[PDB]
Each structure stands twice: as C-alpha cells, then as structure tokens.
Amino acid sequence: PFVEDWDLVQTLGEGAYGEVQLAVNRVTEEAVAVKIVDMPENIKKEICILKMLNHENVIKFYGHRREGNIQYLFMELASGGSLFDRIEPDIGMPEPDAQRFFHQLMAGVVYLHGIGITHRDIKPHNLLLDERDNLKIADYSLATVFRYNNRERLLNKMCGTLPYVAPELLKRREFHAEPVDVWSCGIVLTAMLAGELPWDQPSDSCQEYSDWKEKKTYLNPWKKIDSAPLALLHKILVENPSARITIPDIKKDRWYNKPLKK
Template sequence: MATQIGTEAEEFVEGWDFIQTLGEGAYGEVKLVVNRMTQEAVAVKIIDLSKYPAAKNDIRKEIAVHRLLKHKNIIQFFGNRVEGKLHYIFLEYAAGGELFDRIEPDIGMPQPDAQLYFRQLVEGMAYLHKLGVTHRDVKPENLLLDTDDTLKITDFGLATVFRYQGKERQLNKRCGTLPYVAPEVISAKEYKAEPADIWSCGVVLVALLAGELPWDQPHYDNKEYYDWKECNITLTPWSKINNLALSLLRKILLPNVEKRASIEQIQNHVWFTKKFNKDVSNLSSTIATSKRKCSNLNLSPSPTKEYSTGMSASQPLWHGSAGADIDHKPVLEGLLHGACFSQPVHKADDILISTQMHGTQGNSQTLLQKLVKRMTRFIVTTAADETIDRLTTVLKDMPGYSYKHNSLGEVTITTRDRRNVPLVFKAHLLDMNSNILLDFRLSKGDGIEFKRHFLKIKRKLTAIVNVKAPITWPSPAVSSPMLSTT
C-alpha cells in the first residue's frame, strides 16, 4: 500500500484545526491547534485519564504551579478543561522551536548566542525563585524559543513550591534528568531548591558553549565529574570553553552548596555582563588551556557512598493557593469552555509530555508558517514510498538502530545514545506543495544526542537530499501543510 502523507488539517473543535503533533508524553500528546479565522496558535496537552489514572494528581499539581506564573521567559498557561476523562491544558505556542536544536553537537554555539539564551534562562529562574517555585528539571529540552528568540521555560511537571508565606522548606525528592541534576539531589539527603536549579543552569551553559554534556551524572564514581573535581580542565568539554566563561562555571558547578553562586552573583559576573562581538569564537585565542588555574574552584569533598541512581518523577504535594485564573483572550473561549472535543488521544510511548512543547501566536501567518522551526528536516528529491524505503534501508544497515513504520508515513526510530540511554525519535513526511519534506522530531531522550543521530542519518541519505531547497525553517512560499496525523 502506498505511503500516505495526509491531505488536510484535521478539525479539533469548531473553528480550530490540528496542524501538527508537537510531542508525546507518558500520559498523552501535545498538539498545535490553530484558529481558522484568526490564525491564533495554541499548544494543547491532551491527557486521557481513563488510560492513565495515575496522572490525575500530577496534572493537578502541574496546573496549580503553572497557573501562578506570568513572565516573558515562562511559557504562558492559558487554562485547562476536562471533558469526561480527557484533560486539556492550553499553553502558549513557541514557534521558534527547541533550544537544543540551536546547539551543534560537539561544537555548541557562538558565545554571544549562548550569553543571550543564558541571560534569559537566569532571568526566568530568578522570577520563579522569587515566587518560591523551583523547576527541578532545567535542561535544553525544556527551554523553547519564540520567533523573536525569546527563551521560554516550559514543562512544570516536576515543579513544586519551596517557599510559601515566607516559610521555606527543603526538598527530598530525587527527580530530574541525571546529567543536569545537582550532586545533592542524588545524595538521598534533603536539599535546597534554589542552588539545585542553579546547578542545572550551569550544565545548560556547558551544553551551549561546548555542544556536549560534562558528565553522565555528578557522582564521584563518574570519571568526567571526578576530573572536574580534581581541576583537570584541559580535557573536553572544558577545553572548548574560554577562561572567562569557565570562571563563571567554576562558581556555579560547585558541589559545596553554601559556596555555589547565587543568581545575583551570576548576574554580576563579568562574562554575564560583557558585550560580545558577534564574531567572538567559543575558544579563547589568547590564553592556552594548559595554563589554566583551579585556585578558585573550591570543590567540596567527594559525596558519601549513600547514593541511588533511581530518580523519581514525582514531586511533593503542595496544598497552597492555586492562584487566580488568567484572563483569556476571547478567541480562546471556545477551546476553554464551550466547544465539544472529538479528537481521540492515541497511546504514547512513555515519554515526558512537555519535552516538545512549543508556543506563540501570530495573526497574519498561513497555517504552514505555524509549523515549529526545526533544523532537523530537509526536502528530498524522491517520492514518498521511495523516501521511506531509502530511510528504512539506511536504518537496517546502522548497528544499534531499530524502527517501526506505519502507513501514515511515520517511522519511529529507537537507539541508544553515548551514555547508553534510550533515544527515540520519529521521522514523518510533509507534503510541501509538490515537494516532500522529511521531518524528524525527538520523542524521548537527550536533545543534543538526537541531533547528533539525525546528522548521521542525513549524511547517509545525501543522495536524496534536495540541496537546491535546503529547508530548515518553514517557508512562506508554500500554501498549506499536508501533515500526516498520528
């Protein structure tokens, strides 16, 4: 049977169309819906509680925290609605895509760009902490961009309140993503919320500047972490980072919580305040890495043996006020209150729901222009069936890869990354006005690793890549998206 690409957008409710699946999670999907008349775009997270009853408390807690937040660097929460066992959460749509997509594997990005995004991340975290909220899963996959390159923190599934009415509490849940968590989070002891988030921000900065993560986990048994503690900073990723940025990382990535930099100290650091020229390289051209000193590293002694690699995905329950409802735009009223939802939710593959959330509105763009910006896509010279044949043939010849292909033109690819952690991503076909776009989307795993595997697959498909139409962003020249539905 011929591979189907799809012929039209699918109606979500009256006046609103499904345009694209943005992501999948343990309890459902995140989809982009666009108002047919106004072209307003909204991300909707769909959870089927009949299939996943355990999600009820998690979703309630996520909503209670997220609805408190309103800041330019936080994905906006518009509202939620329940239809029987189906739960809908409506969020801002960030059309600029995921931050990890801007990171070149093993390279990173220019310092001015890294500084731009890091400044916004710190500003967003300062806002959260001022409200007494901790995110607890800061990583590039949870950082989105709008069309103006404004960074948006998303995915508050692990967030909790650590300060309420002036009273602060320590946390004890081990949760987050291992390469980004602070050492005290995995030590099976109580920990302070703010320093733990700050540590994660520091690991994000390493990824921005070096295009790789510094360690699998911040534990003394890990060689890369041990090297950092022992001031061996002539090795990668530290050798890719200039001394000014490294001096900031020395203050952030301190196991000693009491000496770890605060947000105010980060904002006053010379790297944070310096005005970089756009042609500044990641690497320092004037100071050799071999001459670096570790005198101000101030690393604490190794953690004790009291340690477990089991990370919890749950957060402590907070019974405080949920906050006032946000005033919704009139065009959203049909989504939030009156419309009848008819689209069934399809089973997901045990993936974090909001890893792929995107968000922002526009009022004059075509439906196609609403597609999220993504570097992991390209136009092919082959027809749909041949494209799928070429892709699956390549995957068969790549050790460690497996795949499933359905008749809707979607291939689910499963492998393991360099840390031996499962990595799942999907490739599907989009009809771009007589051209076929092969689009890849992360489902589960590390974003930088996903991009590294995408580039490997793309190189093996060089023969069918249309170099005359190197689409990486949505093009205004094509009329309408022809998307496969899942």
C-alpha cells in the same frame, strides 16, 4: 482530532505524561500549544502552578479543558522551537547567543524562585524560543512550591534528568531547591558553549565528574570553552550546594557582564 473550536494539526513533542500538539483555531487562525494528558492529582498541582505564571521568559498558560478522562492544557506556542535544536553537537553555538540565552534563563529562574516555584528539570528541551529568539521556560509537570508564606521547604523527591541534576540530589536526604536549578543552568551553559554534556551524572563513581572536581580542564568539554565563561562554570558547578554561586552573584560575574557580538 479537535478540541472544541481548535484543530490538533501537528505533534510538537512528547513526555511521560501525555503529548504536546499544535492547536490552530478554525475561525481566528491563532496557533497555540496543547498538552494532552490521559487519565489527576498531579495535573491538579500543575494547573495550580501554571495559573500563577506571568513573565516574558516563562511559557504563558491560557487555560484548560477536560473532555472525559483527557485534560487539555493550552499554552503559548513558541514558534522558534527548542534551545536543543540550536546547539550544534560538539560545537555549541556562538558565545554572544549563548550569553543572551543565559541572561534570559536567569530572568526566568529569578522570576520562578521569586514566586516560590522550582522547575526541577531545566535542560535545553525545556527552553523554548519565540519568533524573536526569546527564551521561555516550558513544562511544569515536575515543578513544585519550595517557598510558601515566606517559609522555605527543603525538597527530598528525586527528579530531573541525570546529566543535568545537582550532586546533592543523589547524596542528601533533603536539599535546597534554588541551588539545584542554578546547577542545571550551568550544565545548560556548558551545552551551549561546547555542544557536549560533561558527564552521565555527578556521582562518586563517575570519572568525568571526578576529573572536573580535580580541575582537569584540559579535557572535553572544558577545553572548548573560553577562560571567561569557564571561570563562571567553576563557581556554578561546585559540589557543596552552600558554597555554590547564587543568582545575585552570577549577575556580578565578569563573563555575565562581558560585552560580546557576532
């Protein structure tokens, strides 16, 4: 297959609304990623959000083309693949690499929040790596505006991935967008440090969640994580979204600022 002057050479991945392909320009050899979407109001909102993005830890938007009923969304190709494939199951990854990925994730999230955008589905499958292992937040099909004209809008739509969602999404009619992204970044940090997700969902009927609320850190995955990043996880994975640590205070955390190497 092809799109104008590009060849669709390989399937990079897929989601509920389309598939992502590797596009190689026949003439210049420039390699990009292209989201191919079949059939309109959702993609309109997505293209609007995509054109606002300009940051080193966010996937760049190059442009779009419509060919009949198929939309092609050209984006920056991240040649290192996903953060998901760098997490060894039941092990995680070296703490210095987890910390570097966490700083870059914070930088992307501060940027998105600064321009009034919430990603709403932060997880390792959506965190891509460039050729120098720089983290890029990808896929804005669930992203939305939570601040416009310096006025915050509370969210109410259920979305995301259950092991990564914050508990207020399940227990509240309306909720603040920022604490939700911070909570999923804590689950991403747990995954990088232990290679294991702590629960199916943070609900009243989930025993692993109740175990965390009761501070049973002698259980997995918490027992594989050092006391310093565990102390930061204790401030991020707080049930009340208003008691939960904000990103300005995550940047003052002992582990966040702890020099690490290897």
